[PDB]
Structure formats: C-alpha cells, structure tokens
Amino acid sequence: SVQIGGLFIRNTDQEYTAFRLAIFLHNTFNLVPHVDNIETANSFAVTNAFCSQYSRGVFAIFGLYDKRSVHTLTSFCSALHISLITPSFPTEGESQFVLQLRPSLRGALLSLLDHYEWNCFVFLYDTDRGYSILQAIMEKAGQNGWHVSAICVENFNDVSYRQLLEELDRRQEKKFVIDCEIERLQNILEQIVSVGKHVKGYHYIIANLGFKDISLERFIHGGANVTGFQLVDFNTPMVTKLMDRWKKLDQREYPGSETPPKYTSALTYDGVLVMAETFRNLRRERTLKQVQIQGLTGNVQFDHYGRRVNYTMDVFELKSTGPRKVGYWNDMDKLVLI
Amino acid sequence: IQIGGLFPRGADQEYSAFRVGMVQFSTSEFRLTPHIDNLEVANSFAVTNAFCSQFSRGVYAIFGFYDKKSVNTITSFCGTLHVSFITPSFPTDGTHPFVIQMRPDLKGALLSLIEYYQWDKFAYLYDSDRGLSTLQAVLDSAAEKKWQVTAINVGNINNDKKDETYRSLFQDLELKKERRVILDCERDKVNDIVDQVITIGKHVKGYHYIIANLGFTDGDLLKIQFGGANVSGFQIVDYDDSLVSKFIERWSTLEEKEYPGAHTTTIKYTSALTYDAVQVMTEAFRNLRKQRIAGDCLAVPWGQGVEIERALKQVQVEGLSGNIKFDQNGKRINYTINIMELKTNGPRKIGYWSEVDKMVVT
Ligand SMILES: *[C@@H]1O[C@H](CO)[C@@H](O)[C@H](O)[C@H]1NC(C)=O
C-alpha cells in the first residue's frame, strides 16, 4: 500500500469527485487517500491539516490553494521535502518540490490580442489568481503603446455593475477582455445581457480554459463576437470511454456524469495519472519531473521548474451554429490558423 | 344554501383563493356547500355532464370558468333553466342574460392609451384562443381613424419550433421597420414572447411595448427592466389601498402545504375576481334573507328565477378590484383601471381609465 494525501477546500466539490473517481477506477499498489476537507482556505487551518497529514505519514500530497495560503503551503512542501502536485494557478520564480498542472494563459492571450491587432480596450480582472496576467498586460501595453483601462470588480454588486457598464458605454470602448472566476464570469455574462450588449459590434475575449463549460446560447442568438480557449479534447476515444464509464456509476456518489468534464476535473485526473506513473516508475523529485504521459489535456511533460511544456490548446470562436474551432496555440509554433 | 363549482384543470391558485374567501367571509347565520368539480373547460361534453350533475341536486347558483369553445353551451343551458352562472371569465359580446360577469373590458382602454400616445402604423400580435373580440375592434378603429395595422397570429405554434417562430416574427418586423407592438396574450405566452425579445435584443431605447392583459405586475418584468425600451400596461388591483394591504398581510402567512401558493407578494387578477365573487355572492344571499324571501337537464323553470337573478345583479359593494355594481346585463359599469409604466424603478402610476371621463393623466 502506498499512502497519498488529499487536501481540498470549499466550493470545489467536483475536484473531490474527480479525485475519488480517479482513485476508485485506478485501484479497481492500492493508493491510500488521506483526504481532510477544510471549509475556509486560511493559513492556519491549511498548516494544521498539512501537519496532520505529514504526521500520519505521506509520500505525496495533492492539494488546492488560493492567493492567501499558497506561500505557506509551498514553503512547508519545499522545507519538508514532500512533493506537492496541484492544479491551481501557476506561480512565478524558482520553485522546488511543487508540480503545477495548469498551463499558463499569458502567451496565448498575448498572441490572440496581437492577432486581432487592438490598440484600445477594457480589461476586467480579479486578484483571485495573482497579479501575473495584469502585470503582463500592463507591460505589453507599455511596450506597444496601447490604451487599457483595467477595472477591479472583486467587490461589485448588481447596481455597481450596471452603472459601470453604462459609464463604459458612454465612452467608446466596444472591446472587453474578461478574466475572473467561473461564478464571477457567469455574473458578468448574465448582467451584460440585461443592459443589451449581446448584439453585433462587440468582441469579448473569455480568458480561461472553460469556453465550452459555460452557456453562451444567448450570445449565439445575439451574434456578438466571442473568442475563447479550450484545453480538453472531446473527440478522443479516451475521454468518451472515461465519460461513459462515469455514466455507468451511480449519481449518489459521483455527480456530474451528464456533462463533459471541465478543465479542473481533467487537470486533477491527469495529476492522479502522473502520480501513479511516478510511483510505478519508482518501483523499478527527480523521477517525478521526468514523467511524459498522454492525459485528457494532451501531452503532459514538465521542465526542471515543474511548469508545463509541449502543450497544445485550441482557440474557439462563437458563430451562429455554435462554437467553431479556428486554430490552435503551441509554445514552439506560436499561433497556427486554419 | 348550496353553491357549486366548475373550476378548470391546471388552475390551483384560483381554488386556493376560493377557499380563502370561504374562510374569510364567516357566516354563522347561513353556510353554503361548495361541492366543487374539476374538468377541462375546452371539452363541451364534460362541461354539459358536470352542469347536469350540479342541476340534479338543486344547486342555487353555479360558479366556474369557460373559454371561447364552451361559452355558448353554458349560456344556452343557463338561459333555458334560469340558473345564474357567475363567471370571472372574459366578457361575452351581446346581451346574454343570467350570466353575471365580473371582469372589466380591456376594450376602450387600449384605444384610449393608443391615442394619448399619438401613433400611427403600429403592430399588433393577437392570439386565436381568447377570441376575435379585441382584434375586430382594433381593425374597426384603424379603418375609422386611418391607422395602419400589421396583424400577426401568435399562438397555435408547435413547442419544438416556438422559439424559432417567435424569433422569426421579430426578425421579419425588423425588415419592415416597425418599432411599436401591442402584446396581448396570457401570462404563459407573454413571458415567452418577452424572453425571446430579450434574446434578440430590442430592449434598448427606441422600442415601446404595451402589455394588454391587465395584470402587468405578475409577468416577471425584472428581466425587461433596467433597459432602454419603454414598457406600459394596465392594472386592476392596486397594491397600496387599505383593503389590499390588509389582504396581503394575511396572504403570506398561510402555507402551501394546506393552501397552495400564498407565499408571494403578488396575486393574479383572476384569483382576486374569484375572491370578490365569493363576497358578492354571500352578500347577495344575505340581502335575500334580509328581505325574508328539479329533475334532469334533458327534461321547466325552477322556483325563483327573478328572485335570485335580480337580487344578485342589484348588488353594490367594494372589493379589491374596486367598486362592484352590475347593470341590467350583468357587466361592470363603475370600474376604474389604473395606468402604469415601467422605469428603472418599479411600476409607477400614470393615470386611470374610467367610463365617466375618457382618459385621465396624473
Ligand atoms: C419612450 O417614452 C418617452 C417618454 O414618454 C417618449 O418620448 C419616447 O418616444 C418613447 N419611446 C418610444 C420608442 O415610444
């Protein structure tokens, strides 16, 4: 038996569901989960949970973190020589004993805004995933002499949202770039319709990996141009096999067996597969970073710093008949169009 | 005293309002017997069978609903048997005796708001289930006053292609450069129509949408609010009077386990008409007891035709709808209808429509 640790926070029920799915189907060297769910993602509770998991004895911990508790978790993981595989937002700078599965969206977003050749737009953002995207956008705008009006919408309510939208309507902007959480993006999309801006003339850019994970039917009927990114490939027989087997299990324990998996579920499944590959290779840190596998999100391979390399991501546009792929982005070939 | 009922299927709020009216108007001196039935008003055979069953046990008065395909049968049966039938359904056209009607007429108000707003070349989206009694008046008025109508038949639409058809209607009207439409359909239809409007857009400034279904505070305007398009409508139950406030104070208290509904702030106009019907009927029999006054349906008039009909038609009372006093035929004669319009804020009073003065602006 090989012992593994599991750390999860609130409003990530599907993450835990995907983790339990992966563990169940992989075992049926049986893994021994040590999950300890925590409600509030603060430093003290995360530290206590990590201490409990370490005291019980763990070889690798799969956990989730936010802006506040990232530093403590990374510090203890680096200090105690315990590998931590996480699907959360990537960090910056030198990091050790930390493996990150979520690819960085900076390059693809920069390439997309370069392709459409924009010189003035509005950037809506939140600080729930660091300041990397905002800093990169500001640096690029300064280098290329652009005109960006970044507005924080962390503490905005419906009245504030509508008034801000009307004020931005008074000026001629016509181009928005949204980068927020799933719930925040849903709120933005459900209050942009009420004002009456889901009409031809605007071009929104959804900056995430869940373009097909959100409902854009209203925008499809409206005709407003929308462009997003996709990482999970749905025509692969592997994902169809896994999803059909998900249907074959009960819904009382593994909810979500009626929709294609989001980016985070695929990331957690790929992390579990990578960790199992690492154990199997170790049967025959340095070994962890040498893994090269084919997961739901494509090729999985890491450099000496634990960041993603050799990853492909498709770019989708919203048409009258629905989403339509227009090309794909790669690190070595930059943007490729069809 | 026994008073039956022919309430329709798919309607539960009305019958809840009926039982609440039963409870509220307590009567120790006399008590009536509901003996309520339930069937599809669109099928004439069930209606005739239920009417005969009620008539076979000596019911003094019947109270129920009907539609365009069943009003003639009820009228014919009540005419020959002298049994009064109180109905909050749509006003019938022509003098049909022994049918007490408790709904004001939309006609005349839609033609007094379409002229207070000086218009021409408008659009009209009618439905072919309520009846061709409002569209005909609109055509007559347009012919008399040189207006240009563009009639469209909404309804009788397959649910599979309902979205596509409703969207295509607005898409076609966009080609003809029409910006004024007059929606007049039941709540279920108008909700879908405004939803598809918002889906296409058209809720920005430059479009005026009249709702012509009374009500206007129960169609979930929150979706169409906070936009640029104008919204205007008619209302019968004002929500600030002492009587209506007293009603709504006890309306929310009752639970849905025993009394379905009764947890929301607004109530449909039909249920208010039913609740007022309860009171006007109980007081009608009260007046007769103050004055100290059947075989099969396929067989002679029964004991007291005039004594019940005239007494019930000479009532003068005040309820949620306002003044309730019937004329010789049985239709309302002293009703006032509030005018409302939608803004960034909730509905605001603009005036009132009455028989004594054509149109009032306040
Ligand atoms: C909306 O209402 C205003 C104020 O009454 C009026 O001036 C304007 O013409 C209306 N718009 C339409 C499209 O009817």
GROMACS .gro file of C-alpha atoms in nm, chain A:
model
  338
    1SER     CA    1   0.000   0.000   0.000
    2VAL     CA    2   0.119   0.350  -0.095
    3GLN     CA    3  -0.005   0.644   0.112
    4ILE     CA    4  -0.117   0.966  -0.057
    5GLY     CA    5  -0.258   1.286   0.091
    6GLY     CA    6  -0.559   1.483  -0.026
    7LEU     CA    7  -0.632   1.848   0.053
    8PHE     CA    8  -0.943   2.027  -0.072
    9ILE     CA    9  -1.126   2.349   0.009
   10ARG     CA   10  -1.483   2.476  -0.019
   11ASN     CA   11  -1.670   2.530  -0.349
   12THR     CA   12  -1.453   2.261  -0.515
   13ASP     CA   13  -1.686   1.963  -0.480
   14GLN     CA   14  -1.623   1.849  -0.839
   15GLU     CA   15  -1.248   1.845  -0.766
   16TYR     CA   16  -1.303   1.594  -0.484
   17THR     CA   17  -1.547   1.398  -0.700
   18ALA     CA   18  -1.290   1.369  -0.979
   19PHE     CA   19  -1.018   1.271  -0.731
   20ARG     CA   20  -1.235   0.995  -0.583
   21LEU     CA   21  -1.326   0.880  -0.935
   22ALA     CA   22  -0.959   0.858  -1.035
   23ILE     CA   23  -0.862   0.673  -0.716
   24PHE     CA   24  -1.152   0.427  -0.744
   25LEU     CA   25  -1.103   0.342  -1.111
   26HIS     CA   26  -0.723   0.323  -1.085
   27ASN     CA   27  -0.728   0.087  -0.788
   28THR     CA   28  -1.015  -0.126  -0.921
   29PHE     CA   29  -0.022  -0.089  -0.521
   30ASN     CA   30  -0.359   0.034  -0.395
   31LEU     CA   31  -0.343   0.402  -0.303
   32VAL     CA   32  -0.445   0.512   0.047
   33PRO     CA   33  -0.618   0.853   0.041
   34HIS     CA   34  -0.587   1.080   0.346
   35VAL     CA   35  -0.838   1.346   0.246
   36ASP     CA   36  -0.910   1.622   0.501
   37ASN     CA   37  -1.158   1.874   0.361
   38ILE     CA   38  -1.137   2.228   0.502
   39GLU     CA   39  -1.407   2.494   0.479
   40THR     CA   40  -1.209   2.821   0.491
   41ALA     CA   41  -0.883   2.845   0.296
   42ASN     CA   42  -0.681   3.034   0.555
   43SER     CA   43  -0.318   2.980   0.651
   44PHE     CA   44  -0.376   2.836   0.999
   45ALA     CA   45  -0.618   2.558   0.904
   46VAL     CA   46  -0.414   2.462   0.597
   47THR     CA   47  -0.099   2.444   0.811
   48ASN     CA   48  -0.275   2.229   1.072
   49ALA     CA   49  -0.414   1.993   0.806
   50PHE     CA   50  -0.071   1.962   0.643
   51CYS     CA   51   0.083   1.888   0.983
   52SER     CA   52  -0.174   1.614   1.046
   53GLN     CA   53  -0.119   1.460   0.702
   54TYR     CA   54   0.259   1.467   0.746
   55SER     CA   55   0.240   1.320   1.097
   56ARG     CA   56   0.027   1.031   0.971
   57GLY     CA   57   0.291   0.972   0.703
   58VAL     CA   58   0.251   1.078   0.340
   59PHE     CA   59   0.473   1.044   0.032
   60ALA     CA   60   0.286   1.292  -0.192
   61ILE     CA   61   0.003   1.540  -0.133
   62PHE     CA   62  -0.249   1.654  -0.395
   63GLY     CA   63  -0.391   1.981  -0.268
   64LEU     CA   64  -0.561   2.303  -0.374
   65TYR     CA   65  -0.469   2.655  -0.266
   66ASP     CA   66  -0.565   3.019  -0.321
   67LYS     CA   67  -0.385   3.354  -0.313
   68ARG     CA   68  -0.360   3.371   0.066
   69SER     CA   69  -0.243   3.018   0.151
   70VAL     CA   70  -0.014   2.947  -0.146
   71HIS     CA   71   0.302   3.080   0.019
   72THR     CA   72   0.273   2.875   0.338
   73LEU     CA   73   0.191   2.552   0.155
   74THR     CA   74   0.478   2.594  -0.091
   75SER     CA   75   0.718   2.685   0.191
   76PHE     CA   76   0.637   2.379   0.403
   77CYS     CA   77   0.639   2.150   0.098
   78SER     CA   78   0.983   2.277  -0.004
   79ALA     CA   79   1.116   2.259   0.353
   80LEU     CA   80   0.997   1.907   0.441
   81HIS     CA   81   1.094   1.752   0.103
   82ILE     CA   82   0.735   1.639   0.039
   83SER     CA   83   0.620   1.659  -0.322
   84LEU     CA   84   0.300   1.856  -0.382
   85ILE     CA   85   0.103   1.811  -0.705
   86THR     CA   86  -0.152   2.089  -0.755
   87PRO     CA   87  -0.391   2.200  -1.031
   88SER     CA   88  -0.419   2.561  -0.905
   89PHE     CA   89  -0.284   2.874  -1.075
   90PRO     CA   90   0.088   2.868  -1.161
   91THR     CA   91   0.333   3.073  -0.957
   92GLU     CA   92   0.641   3.267  -1.068
   93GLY     CA   93   1.010   3.235  -0.990
   94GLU     CA   94   1.214   2.939  -0.876
   95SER     CA   95   1.009   2.670  -0.700
   96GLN     CA   96   1.107   2.324  -0.577
   97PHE     CA   97   0.907   2.014  -0.475
   98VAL     CA   98   0.596   2.172  -0.634
   99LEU     CA   99   0.435   2.034  -0.951
  100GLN     CA  100   0.177   2.251  -1.130
  101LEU     CA  101  -0.060   2.104  -1.389
  102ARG     CA  102  -0.247   2.415  -1.504
  103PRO     CA  103  -0.075   2.576  -1.805
  104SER     CA  104  -0.012   2.949  -1.817
  105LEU     CA  105  -0.253   3.151  -2.032
  106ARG     CA  106  -0.022   3.454  -2.073
  107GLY     CA  107   0.133   3.356  -2.406
  108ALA     CA  108  -0.189   3.251  -2.578
  109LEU     CA  109  -0.374   3.564  -2.464
  110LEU     CA  110  -0.089   3.789  -2.580
  111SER     CA  111  -0.079   3.610  -2.916
  112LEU     CA  112  -0.456   3.646  -2.958
  113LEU     CA  113  -0.456   4.020  -2.884
  114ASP     CA  114  -0.160   4.052  -3.122
  115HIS     CA  115  -0.357   3.869  -3.393
  116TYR     CA  116  -0.666   4.087  -3.369
  117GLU     CA  117  -0.437   4.395  -3.358
  118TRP     CA  118  -0.611   4.602  -3.092
  119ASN     CA  119  -0.499   4.941  -2.962
  120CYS     CA  120  -0.770   5.029  -2.706
  121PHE     CA  121  -0.984   4.801  -2.490
  122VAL     CA  122  -1.112   4.743  -2.136
  123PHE     CA  123  -0.970   4.473  -1.907
  124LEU     CA  124  -1.188   4.328  -1.631
  125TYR     CA  125  -0.993   4.124  -1.377
  126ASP     CA  126  -0.984   3.995  -1.021
  127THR     CA  127  -0.697   3.913  -0.785
  128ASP     CA  128  -0.810   3.558  -0.701
  129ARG     CA  129  -0.526   3.411  -0.912
  130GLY     CA  130  -0.238   3.651  -0.852
  131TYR     CA  131  -0.126   3.955  -1.049
  132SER     CA  132   0.061   3.777  -1.330
  133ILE     CA  133  -0.194   3.840  -1.605
  134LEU     CA  134  -0.246   4.206  -1.512
  135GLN     CA  135   0.129   4.272  -1.492
  136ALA     CA  136   0.188   4.103  -1.828
  137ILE     CA  137  -0.093   4.302  -1.991
  138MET     CA  138   0.037   4.630  -1.847
  139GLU     CA  139   0.393   4.553  -1.960
  140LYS     CA  140   0.278   4.468  -2.313
  141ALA     CA  141   0.062   4.781  -2.330
  142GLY     CA  142   0.354   4.995  -2.216
  143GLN     CA  143   0.589   4.836  -2.469
  144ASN     CA  144   0.346   4.863  -2.762
  145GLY     CA  145   0.181   5.194  -2.664
  146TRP     CA  146  -0.169   5.056  -2.609
  147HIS     CA  147  -0.457   5.208  -2.408
  148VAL     CA  148  -0.600   4.972  -2.145
  149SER     CA  149  -0.845   5.064  -1.866
  150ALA     CA  150  -0.813   4.792  -1.603
  151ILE     CA  151  -1.101   4.782  -1.353
  152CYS     CA  152  -1.124   4.559  -1.046
  153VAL     CA  153  -1.467   4.400  -0.998
  154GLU     CA  154  -1.395   4.200  -0.683
  155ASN     CA  155  -1.639   4.393  -0.460
  156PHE     CA  156  -1.908   4.492  -0.712
  157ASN     CA  157  -2.283   4.433  -0.681
  158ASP     CA  158  -2.555   4.444  -0.947
  159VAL     CA  159  -2.613   4.820  -0.923
  160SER     CA  160  -2.240   4.891  -0.940
  161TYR     CA  161  -2.203   4.652  -1.234
  162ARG     CA  162  -2.483   4.816  -1.433
  163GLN     CA  163  -2.363   5.169  -1.359
  164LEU     CA  164  -2.005   5.080  -1.454
  165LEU     CA  165  -2.132   4.921  -1.776
  166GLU     CA  166  -2.336   5.232  -1.859
  167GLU     CA  167  -2.038   5.458  -1.786
  168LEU     CA  168  -1.814   5.248  -2.012
  169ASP     CA  169  -2.094   5.262  -2.270
  170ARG     CA  170  -2.075   5.643  -2.260
  171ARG     CA  171  -1.714   5.616  -2.376
  172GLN     CA  172  -1.643   5.429  -2.698
  173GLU     CA  173  -1.466   5.107  -2.598
  174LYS     CA  174  -1.657   4.828  -2.779
  175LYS     CA  175  -1.392   4.568  -2.678
  176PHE     CA  176  -1.375   4.385  -2.345
  177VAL     CA  177  -1.132   4.126  -2.206
  178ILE     CA  178  -1.268   3.934  -1.906
  179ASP     CA  179  -1.052   3.731  -1.667
  180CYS     CA  180  -1.228   3.622  -1.347
  181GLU     CA  181  -1.357   3.311  -1.171
  182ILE     CA  182  -1.637   3.090  -1.300
  183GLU     CA  183  -1.909   3.244  -1.082
  184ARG     CA  184  -1.783   3.597  -1.149
  185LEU     CA  185  -1.776   3.531  -1.524
  186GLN     CA  186  -2.131   3.392  -1.507
  187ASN     CA  187  -2.248   3.704  -1.322
  188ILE     CA  188  -2.076   3.928  -1.579
  189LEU     CA  189  -2.239   3.737  -1.865
  190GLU     CA  190  -2.585   3.745  -1.705
  191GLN     CA  191  -2.567   4.121  -1.639
  192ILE     CA  192  -2.418   4.212  -1.979
  193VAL     CA  193  -2.736   4.075  -2.143
  194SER     CA  194  -2.979   4.282  -1.934
  195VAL     CA  195  -2.813   4.609  -2.039
  196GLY     CA  196  -2.845   4.493  -2.401
  197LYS     CA  197  -2.488   4.445  -2.524
  198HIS     CA  198  -2.520   4.091  -2.664
  199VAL     CA  199  -2.554   4.246  -3.010
  200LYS     CA  200  -2.323   4.267  -3.311
  201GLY     CA  201  -2.049   4.524  -3.266
  202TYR     CA  202  -1.870   4.395  -2.956
  203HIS     CA  203  -1.591   4.134  -2.930
  204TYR     CA  204  -1.543   3.976  -2.588
  205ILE     CA  205  -1.244   3.756  -2.504
  206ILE     CA  206  -1.310   3.494  -2.237
  207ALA     CA  207  -0.971   3.428  -2.076
  208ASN     CA  208  -0.994   3.081  -1.924
  209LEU     CA  209  -0.984   2.712  -2.017
  210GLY     CA  210  -1.360   2.656  -1.989
  211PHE     CA  211  -1.508   2.812  -2.303
  212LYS     CA  212  -1.738   2.514  -2.363
  213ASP     CA  213  -1.806   2.481  -1.988
  214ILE     CA  214  -2.025   2.794  -1.990
  215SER     CA  215  -2.363   2.861  -2.153
  216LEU     CA  216  -2.335   3.108  -2.441
  217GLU     CA  217  -2.662   3.031  -2.624
  218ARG     CA  218  -2.789   3.385  -2.563
  219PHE     CA  219  -2.471   3.520  -2.722
  220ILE     CA  220  -2.510   3.272  -3.010
  221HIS     CA  221  -2.856   3.408  -3.087
  222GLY     CA  222  -2.738   3.765  -3.029
  223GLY     CA  223  -2.448   3.733  -3.273
  224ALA     CA  224  -2.188   3.923  -3.069
  225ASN     CA  225  -1.835   3.804  -3.140
  226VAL     CA  226  -1.683   3.591  -2.863
  227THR     CA  227  -1.345   3.415  -2.863
  228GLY     CA  228  -1.217   3.167  -2.606
  229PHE     CA  229  -0.974   2.883  -2.544
  230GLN     CA  230  -1.022   2.509  -2.494
  231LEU     CA  231  -0.777   2.255  -2.350
  232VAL     CA  232  -0.982   1.934  -2.316
  233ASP     CA  233  -1.035   1.744  -2.642
  234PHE     CA  234  -1.375   1.576  -2.670
  235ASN     CA  235  -1.338   1.362  -2.986
  236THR     CA  236  -1.064   1.145  -2.833
  237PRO     CA  237  -1.193   0.792  -2.759
  238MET     CA  238  -1.019   0.801  -2.420
  239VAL     CA  239  -1.241   1.078  -2.283
  240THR     CA  240  -1.551   0.912  -2.430
  241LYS     CA  241  -1.456   0.583  -2.261
  242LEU     CA  242  -1.396   0.754  -1.926
  243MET     CA  243  -1.718   0.957  -1.950
  244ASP     CA  244  -1.929   0.654  -2.046
  245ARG     CA  245  -1.786   0.461  -1.751
  246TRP     CA  246  -1.870   0.764  -1.536
  247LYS     CA  247  -2.227   0.726  -1.660
  248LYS     CA  248  -2.217   0.359  -1.559
  249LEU     CA  249  -2.156   0.456  -1.194
  250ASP     CA  250  -2.423   0.585  -0.958
  251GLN     CA  251  -2.508   0.954  -0.926
  252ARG     CA  252  -2.546   0.944  -0.546
  253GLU     CA  253  -2.166   0.946  -0.502
  254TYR     CA  254  -2.017   1.083  -0.828
  255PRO     CA  255  -2.231   1.373  -0.953
  256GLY     CA  256  -2.161   1.532  -1.289
  257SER     CA  257  -2.187   1.219  -1.506
  258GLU     CA  258  -2.413   1.402  -1.755
  259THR     CA  259  -2.177   1.674  -1.883
  260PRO     CA  260  -1.829   1.675  -2.037
  261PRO     CA  261  -1.560   1.741  -1.776
  262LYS     CA  262  -1.435   2.092  -1.709
  263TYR     CA  263  -1.069   2.194  -1.714
  264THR     CA  264  -1.016   2.135  -1.342
  265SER     CA  265  -1.154   1.779  -1.346
  266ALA     CA  266  -0.926   1.687  -1.637
  267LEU     CA  267  -0.633   1.851  -1.456
  268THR     CA  268  -0.697   1.650  -1.139
  269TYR     CA  269  -0.734   1.327  -1.337
  270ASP     CA  270  -0.408   1.397  -1.522
  271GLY     CA  271  -0.233   1.473  -1.193
  272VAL     CA  272  -0.352   1.143  -1.046
  273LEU     CA  273  -0.232   0.958  -1.357
  274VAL     CA  274   0.106   1.134  -1.340
  275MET     CA  275   0.143   1.047  -0.971
  276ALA     CA  276   0.059   0.681  -1.038
  277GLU     CA  277   0.313   0.678  -1.323
  278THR     CA  278   0.569   0.827  -1.083
  279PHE     CA  279   0.510   0.552  -0.826
  280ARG     CA  280   0.524   0.277  -1.089
  281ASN     CA  281   0.850   0.417  -1.229
  282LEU     CA  282   0.993   0.448  -0.877
  283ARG     CA  283   0.915   0.078  -0.828
  284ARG     CA  284   1.189  -0.001  -1.081
  285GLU     CA  285   1.152   1.465  -0.711
  286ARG     CA  286   1.391   1.396  -0.998
  287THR     CA  287   1.186   1.096  -1.113
  288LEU     CA  288   0.862   1.294  -1.073
  289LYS     CA  289   0.968   1.563  -1.322
  290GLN     CA  290   1.075   1.307  -1.586
  291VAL     CA  291   0.719   1.184  -1.648
  292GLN     CA  292   0.582   1.210  -2.003
  293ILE     CA  293   0.222   1.093  -2.038
  294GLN     CA  294  -0.086   1.133  -2.260
  295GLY     CA  295  -0.367   1.273  -2.047
  296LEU     CA  296  -0.707   1.424  -2.119
  297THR     CA  297  -0.542   1.764  -2.172
  298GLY     CA  298  -0.294   1.622  -2.423
  299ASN     CA  299   0.080   1.572  -2.375
  300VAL     CA  300   0.194   1.607  -2.013
  301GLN     CA  301   0.563   1.687  -1.963
  302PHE     CA  302   0.748   1.912  -1.718
  303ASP     CA  303   1.075   2.104  -1.717
  304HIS     CA  304   1.319   2.143  -1.427
  305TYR     CA  305   1.089   2.402  -1.264
  306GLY     CA  306   0.768   2.196  -1.283
  307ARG     CA  307   0.592   2.412  -1.543
  308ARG     CA  308   0.410   2.272  -1.845
  309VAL     CA  309   0.583   2.227  -2.180
  310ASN     CA  310   0.478   2.086  -2.518
  311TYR     CA  311   0.108   2.159  -2.459
  312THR     CA  312  -0.149   2.231  -2.730
  313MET     CA  313  -0.457   2.449  -2.680
  314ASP     CA  314  -0.737   2.512  -2.928
  315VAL     CA  315  -0.897   2.852  -2.991
  316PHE     CA  316  -1.273   2.871  -3.048
  317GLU     CA  317  -1.497   3.143  -3.190
  318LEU     CA  318  -1.870   3.182  -3.133
  319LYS     CA  319  -2.069   3.153  -3.458
  320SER     CA  320  -2.437   3.132  -3.547
  321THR     CA  321  -2.432   2.750  -3.536
  322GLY     CA  322  -2.224   2.737  -3.217
  323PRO     CA  323  -1.854   2.725  -3.130
  324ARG     CA  324  -1.623   2.672  -3.427
  325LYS     CA  325  -1.252   2.598  -3.400
  326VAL     CA  326  -1.033   2.848  -3.587
  327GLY     CA  327  -0.684   2.736  -3.486
  328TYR     CA  328  -0.455   2.627  -3.207
  329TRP     CA  329  -0.172   2.769  -2.997
  330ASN     CA  330   0.159   2.598  -2.919
  331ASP     CA  331   0.476   2.711  -2.746
  332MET     CA  332   0.712   2.612  -3.029
  333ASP     CA  333   0.497   2.716  -3.327
  334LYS     CA  334   0.321   3.015  -3.161
  335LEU     CA  335  -0.030   3.057  -3.311
  336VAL     CA  336  -0.144   2.837  -3.601
  337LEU     CA  337  -0.457   2.922  -3.800
  338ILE     CA  338  -0.675   2.700  -4.017
   0.00000   0.00000   0.00000
